[PDB]
Structure 1
Amino acid sequence: EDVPLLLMNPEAGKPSDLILTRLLVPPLCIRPSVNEDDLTMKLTEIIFLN
């Protein structure tokens, strides 16, 4: 009942969704395999830390 008064639209998202316990990794065509790709390395660092 109080979520609309936070101006969040309750069909586009919830307060619970702000903090993320999960993360999507983009398709490979977003980040092509060739210089030598470092975007994949940034994702690898997050995987290594977990």
Structure 2
Amino acid sequence: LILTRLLVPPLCIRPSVVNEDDLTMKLTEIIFLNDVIKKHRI
């Protein structure tokens, strides 16, 4: 129930010209904040 890993859907779930779908921009922000947290620990 507690998510330590997350699937990202196939590209046909979220087509390249909506340009990118809102799911794709949320997944960018998750990846960015994962880099922010990892750096601030160091």
Q: What is the TM-score with the length of structure 2 in the denominator? A: 0.70
Equivalent residues in 2 for 1:1-40, closer than 5 Å:
18-37=1-20, 38-40=22-24
Higher relative contact order (CA 8 A, sep 6+): 2
Between Structure 1 and Structure 2, whose CA radius of gyration is higher? 1
TM-score, length of structure 1 as denominator length? 0.60
- For structure 1, the 5+ residue unaligned runs are 1-17
Unaligned runs of 5+ in 2: 35-42
More helix, by proportion: 2
User: After TM superposition, what 4+ stretches of structure 1 lie above 6 angstroms from structure 2?
Assistant: none
- Percent identity, please: 91
Q: Aligned AA for 2:28?
A: T
* Aligned equivalent of 1:43, options 22, 27, 40: 27
Q: Tell me how many residue pairs correspond in the alignment.
A: 33
Superposition RMSD in Å: 1.0
